[PDB]
């Protein structure tokens, strides 16, 4: 069970302020003034059935990053040492009520008064705020989204997910609950699980937490390619009809053909994508969100200091001196690893592999071009306006477009079983 509640805010991507402005804030708060916008994000991505887009929100990762930036820029008001909640403004916005329920336009006096200058990469403790300390349920409800934001902001790459394999997790209630999702997709399962977690925080070793861990393990094993129709984990797997597509859909399935042999014990590790094209992959973001929702009362293992930048080191609840390593991968190379593993297993042919490779190459080309164009547009806007600089997507560099530790990550995930 978690004992320390700490979180990290976003850092400036070369600018001198939090990369968000009034236009983006209004577009985010267009339909609701609550800064906690997990449900709104779920509605916006529309089950990941297609490529969502907009003028100010080109991708789903764009909206995720903007939510993180808004929370980082806004939460610094009640976390000042004086702990006052409604005397200063941030971008023509003020908190309503000490319980942090919504953001409203500033009164005329506060509008005349100067705004707050936010800082970068701040680390805060939830128990410092008196109201959060007083109310446990409120703190537990907020800490899910705070943990998701922290998992996104911890490094400069994409979000982080947690994979765990343990045979003792399975039980009668877990089997009964899992059997009900026979034909649903990963997005729908994530939607229902997230809504349930929002309604009630889970306990340390509850049925919902165990089933969430099992679902994450199944999804990642299927994604790598260790588990398939002819090699199932207790007759469960994930099927994807069009691998390498722009919007992949994964469906839970059962098969009685064969069940793999699982060594006894408890194993786990931490996965993340490095290539920028994660902005258009709903499944990865949803997996990270599920891990964040889990982090409310589970106290996951520590992350090794050497895998994170200097500013993220020695966080009381997240990083440590000796911890697990972060494994990063590239989607395009992982597709090839998937195809090769299936072919060695003997359930795929060369022509099918070639077709999958061609489709993946086309998708990668398209995504790369779109991302570069959007980055250039953002740069031009920042050059034009020097007082309202912003970013619409998390900044990336040219080096991140090459394969990294994909082979090692695939080997580790395979050895997990």
């Amino acid at each position: 069970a978690r004992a320390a509640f700490l979180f990290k805010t976003v850092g400036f991507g070369g600018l001198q302020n939090v990369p968000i402005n009034d236009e983006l804030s209004s577009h985010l708060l267009r339909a609701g003034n609550s800064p906690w916008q997990l449900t709104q994000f779920l509605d916006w991505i529309s089950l990941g059935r297609g490529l969502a887009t907009s003028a100010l929100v080109p991708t789903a990762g764009s909206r995720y990053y903007q939510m993180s930036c808004l929370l980082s820029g806004t939460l610094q008001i009640p976390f000042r040492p004086n702990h006052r909640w409604g005397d200063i403004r941030f971008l023509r916005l003020v908190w309503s009520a000490p319980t942090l329920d919504g953001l409203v336009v500033a009164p005329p006096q506060v509008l005349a008064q100067p705004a707050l200058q936010a800082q970068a990469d701040r680390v805060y403790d939830c128990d410092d705020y008196p109201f959060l300390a007083r109310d446990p349920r409120f703190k537990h409800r907020v800490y899910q989204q705070l943990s998701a934001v922290t998992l996104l902001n911890l490094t400069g790459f994409g979000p982080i997910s947690y994979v765990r394999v343990d045979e003792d997790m399975w039980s009668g209630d877990v089997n009964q609950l899992l059997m009900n999702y026979f034909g649903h997709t990963f997005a729908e399962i994530a939607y229902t699980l997230c809504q349930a977690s929002a309604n009630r925080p889970w306990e340390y070793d509850g049925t919902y937490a165990r089933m969430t861990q099992i679902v994450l393990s199944l999804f990642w094993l299927s994604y790598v390619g260790v588990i398939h129709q002819q090699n199932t984990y207790r007759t469960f797997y994930f099927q994807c009809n069009r691998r390498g597509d722009a919007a992949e859909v994964w469906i839970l399935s059962c098969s009685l053909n064969h069940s793999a042999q699982i060594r006894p014990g408890n194993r786990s590790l931490f996965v993340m994508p490095t290539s920028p094209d994660w902005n258009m992959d709903v499944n990865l973001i949803l997996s990270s969100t599920l891990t964040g929702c889990l982090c409310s009362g589970s106290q996951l293992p520590l992350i090794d200091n050497n895998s994170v930048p200097a500013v993220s080191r020695n966080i009381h609840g997240w990083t440590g001196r000796a911890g697990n390593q972060l494994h990063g991968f590239q989607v395009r190379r992982m597709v090839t690893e998937f195809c090769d593993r299936l072919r060695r297993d003997g359930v795929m042919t060369q022509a099918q592999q070639n077709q999958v490779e061609a489709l993946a190459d086309q998708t990668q080309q398209f995504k790369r071009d779109k991302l570069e164009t959007w980055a250039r547009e953002d740069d031009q806007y920042n050059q034009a306006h020097p007082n309202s600089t912003m970013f619409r997507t998390k900044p990336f560099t040219n080096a991140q477009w090459g394969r990294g530790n994909t082979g090692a990550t695939s080997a580790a995930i395979a050895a997990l079983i």
Binding site: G32, G86, V94, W95, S96, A97, A106, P107, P108
Partner: protein, 98 residues
């Protein structure tokens, strides 16, 4: 409920639906933009006393069996499931209006 602690007796319950001149934060206008609610309902002391003095159980009562028989018909309704959807639509309408 307070037993004999006079300092903790509730004296007002109010709800708000508007805002004052330039006050934007509800925590600053709830105190002075609310309308009290509540009503007293009268009962008869004689009936309550008679009920308290004259009460009996069936001759041979087994509570688990009796309640298993009595509660079963009541738990086949879905009106609560309907009310959930009604509440969702109400909140949707309020946000759309604003």
């Amino acid at each position: 409920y307070v037993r004999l602690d006079r300092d903790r007796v509730p004296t007002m319950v109010g709800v708000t639906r508007q805002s004052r001149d330039t006050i934007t934060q509800p925590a600053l206008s709830l105190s002075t933009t609310n309308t009290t609610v509540g009503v007293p309902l009268a009962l008869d002391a004689r009936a309550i006393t008679v009920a308290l003095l004259s009460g009996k159980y069936p001759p041979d009562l087994v509570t688990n069996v009796w309640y298993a028989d009595a509660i079963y018909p009541m738990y086949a309704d879905t009106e609560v499931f309907s009310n959930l959807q009604r509440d969702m639509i109400t909140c949707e309408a309020v946000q759309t209006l604003v």
